[PDB]
Design a protein around this nucleic acid. Structure first.
Lengths: 414, 71, 71, 414
DNA sequence: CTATCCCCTTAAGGGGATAGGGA
DNA sequence: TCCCTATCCCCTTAAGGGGATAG
């Protein structure tokens, strides 16, 4: 049976799984003519016929989680006909990342446009703890994560095609929820565009609650809307197996050229490079193609989405085997001898080397490093002075320590 | 209309206009004065595509372009 | 706005926008990532000009383009 | 004093003659922002500063008559301070070709916007015969020609900045007026876009009256508008001293490429080539750069303007020294050995040779030749059967004869 | 119906020299 | 007597069209 692809209650097209096992997509003519007309993914440009390229499989594939053991967890829960992308999506198709709503072609279904179950402190403690050992959702990423809907003062579970307002993350790293709650607070303080996250506490479990930037209430506050989006694997129609540059995934050059096509090209380009320094400073090595997203805007326009999925690889040094000299950026910078990528081997000269080839305004590269040079210290404070009374002072300590260590490399020049 | 910001979302839009009009790469190429190969290159690899080329094909689509602010 | 039908009437219109915005060939050339010479060539010899170039310059002018029917 | 340049009662900018004899132009800021905004001439693209290039001089120059005698004829009449372009235009500035209205800076002196003197049959006979041995007009061209305004049923003379509706031509060639009046009826009969011309008879004199296509009554019928235009020498910003290709003027390739920028590019490109055949058929050799114009349209757009100034070089053979083998097109076609131009040596293979390099649709060159092949005969009949009872049957005879001679070269293939 | 493919001959943007342009 | 910008030099690279045909 085909899957009809919906986007905020508008028929975009249909996913077809042929005998031969060949995935195919055809845009609904009505959508090709709509006000809201835009490709599902930039790897799948509005046209008339059946789209047959690997971009169709890879795109939809990139809606599901990567660990395909987690895929078995889904084939088990909602009895899937396979671990195939099509068969899985026919079960949890409802709330997927981005803004796509896959409902069987049979599957019309008027599923509650706006319905939710106000959870208790104990039901929450059940749901949170659950993912370790109507809820038709789909979260794509590197670690185990679900999603919820915050309304009024309560954490509720969506019902039907009802959208979620928060991406909730469970502790995998011993305190992944604390590590990322920091880096986020930090990233905001340094002006980087990130989503507001909070920490929810349910009895014993401790979980992270990130506000979704691909979700927005209509003017009337009567409907929650899904904002179409897609990551850098989908944009280039690549399989999630290559999210990392070291595996074939897109790097700076690739992303920067692409961004030239943004609505806010010059601003994004800047923001992007800037983030590449931020990642360096807080030792984040999770900077892969699937961690950068563009919003898709009517007509085929796109603009960089805020940054997300930020963690620091610092609270994992020393006592274990890991060392600062073993931390390498996902995306390499231009070096004297090829391309360097080892954080503790990286220096401002490498960012300016990069900016040199990419033809990124040298002066703006100078301004970024500058701005960091004289901001970091003040930032760490304001953030540290925000950490709730129960925050693991080793996470703070570890990150805050190394940030300065690296920050020195900057202030001695800028 | 819809704001274009790159050679690719450009070629995409125009290729759309060709299909939604029933034209082939061949008939448009004849009218103007370029080879069918060029139209095809433009549609799949518009990055390194000349401006005269692009307007040629613009004309063959009974189309035109205009600048505006990106807001 | 006004319908453009060639590389030349295009460069003219964009050059205008630049002047009536007090920008120099140099400053725009920096923001994007291109040579000042290229902005010059485009302005005086837009026929043989690449499409990425043109969009690069399009962006630096805080502009965008759109297709339309020639009527 | 600077000349304020007006266009249908709109302030475009100002011509300034510097002390060094320097011609310059600056667009009026209010014009750069207008709805109707367009460059005076494509050689003079809208911008902010003072324009100082040769295009400024050449453009305005190409508004006055070719012959420098006609020019003295004007420095006499309206007592000019020189034969200089600026100085002459400061006299006959009002009704110039195209649409421009040059009125001294010291001269709001607003012109009766709509005023005319209904002429008598004798007044006409006087103005017509005059151009051989308030009337501030300017006609650019190869031969001696004035211009009048036809309203109701009377030929009137404009008064002020009142536009004209007919370009009237005087007999120079012994019957130029009759030659062209034939050529026009013919060109229309064959689908070519030319203006409706009539013959006016005033006592003894015999003149040709061509309807201007650069003139148009507003909706209300209360204002006569001038349509901005310019010829191929102005468009390329060349001096009228090079209107002929053999002198350095633009030819087919040049015109064609340019036309590619037209609003009606593909149609224009066709008509133009088509007209290259017509001129060949009626042995017209006056096909020079100043005989092709484009209308200037809001924004800077342009389309080909009807064809004009058509005369046949046939009634001038035999009894004089001139011979068919001495007739050469103004603009050359691609040949085996370089480029051929001699009418009596030209064949269809040449037009197709040309289309070949220019990359003009070979199939459309085939359709043009073919259409002519099977229309000429019918055309000549319908035109002949229109010639007034008092039409010099030698003109008819001479043209109609050689046309078939050449036409034979076509039918024999198409 | 597109898309490479062998071959081309007028040469993109650009490396950053570089010299009148105009106010 | 000075910023601005139309050019101008040398190497990597090479529009695309030109025309035979390959999924």
């Amino acid at each position: 049976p085909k899957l009809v692809t919906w986007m905020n209650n508008q028929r975009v097209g249909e996913l077809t799984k042929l005998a031969n096992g060949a995935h195919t997509f055809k845009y609904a003519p009505e959508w090709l003519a709509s006000r809201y007309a835009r490709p599902l993914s930039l790897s799948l440009p509005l046209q008339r016929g059946n789209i047959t390229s690997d971009a169709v499989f890879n795109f939809f594939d990139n809606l599901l989680p990567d660990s395909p053991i987690v895929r078995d967890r889904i084939v088990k829960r909602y009895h899937a006909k396979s671990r195939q992308p099509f068969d899985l999506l026919s079960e949890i198709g409802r709330d997927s990342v981005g803004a796509v709503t896959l409902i069987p072609e049979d599957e019309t279904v008027t599923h509650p446009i706006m319905a939710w179950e106000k959870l208790t402190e104990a039901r929450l403690e059940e749901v949170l703890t659950a993912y370790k050992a109507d809820f038709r959702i789909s979260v794509a990423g590197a670690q185990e994560k679900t999603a919820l809907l915050r309304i009024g003062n309560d954490w509720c579970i969506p019902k039907g095609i009802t959208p979620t307002t928060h991406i909730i993350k469970l502790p995998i790293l011993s305190q992944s929820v604390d590590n990322e709650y920091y880096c986020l607070l930090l990233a905001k303080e340094l002006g980087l565009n990130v989503p507001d996250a909070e920490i929810i506490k349910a009895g014993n479990v401790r979980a992270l609650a990130v506000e979704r930037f691909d979700r927005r209430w209509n003017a009337e506050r009567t409907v929650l809307l899904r904002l179409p989006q897609e990551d850098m694997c989908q944009t280039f129609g690549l399989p999630s197996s290559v999210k990392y540059e070291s595996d074939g995934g897109p790097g700076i050059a690739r992303i920067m050229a692409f961004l030239m096509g943004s609505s806010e090209a010059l601003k994004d380009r800047y923001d992007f490079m800037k983030f590449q320094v931020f990642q360096w400073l807080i030792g984040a090595t999770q900077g892969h193609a699937k961690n950068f997203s563009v919003f898709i805007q009517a007509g085929g326009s796109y603009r960089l989405t805020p940054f997300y999925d930020i963690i620091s690889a610092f609270p994992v040094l020393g006592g274990t085997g890991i060392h600062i000299s073993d931390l390498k950026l996902a995306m390499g910078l231009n070096a004297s001898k090829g391309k360097k990528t080892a954080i503790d081997k990286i220096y401002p000269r490498h960012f300016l080397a990069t900016a040199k080839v990419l033809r990124f305004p040298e002066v703006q590269m100078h301004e970024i490093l500058s701005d960091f040079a004289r901001m970091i210290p003040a930032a760490l404070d304001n953030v540290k002075t925000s950490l709730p009374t129960d925050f693991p002072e080793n996470v703070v300590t570890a990150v805050e320590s190394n940030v300065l260590r690296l920050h020195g490399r900057l202030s001695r020049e800028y | 209309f819809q704001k274009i910001y790159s050679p690719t979302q450009l070629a995409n839009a125009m290729k759309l206009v060709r299909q939604q009009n029933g034209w082939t790469q061949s008939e448009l190429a004849k009218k103007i004065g370029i080879k069918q190969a060029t139209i095809s290159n433009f549609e799949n690899n518009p990055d390194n595509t000349t401006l005269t080329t692009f307007f040629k094909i613009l004309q063959s689509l009974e189309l035109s372009m205009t600048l505006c602010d990106t807001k």
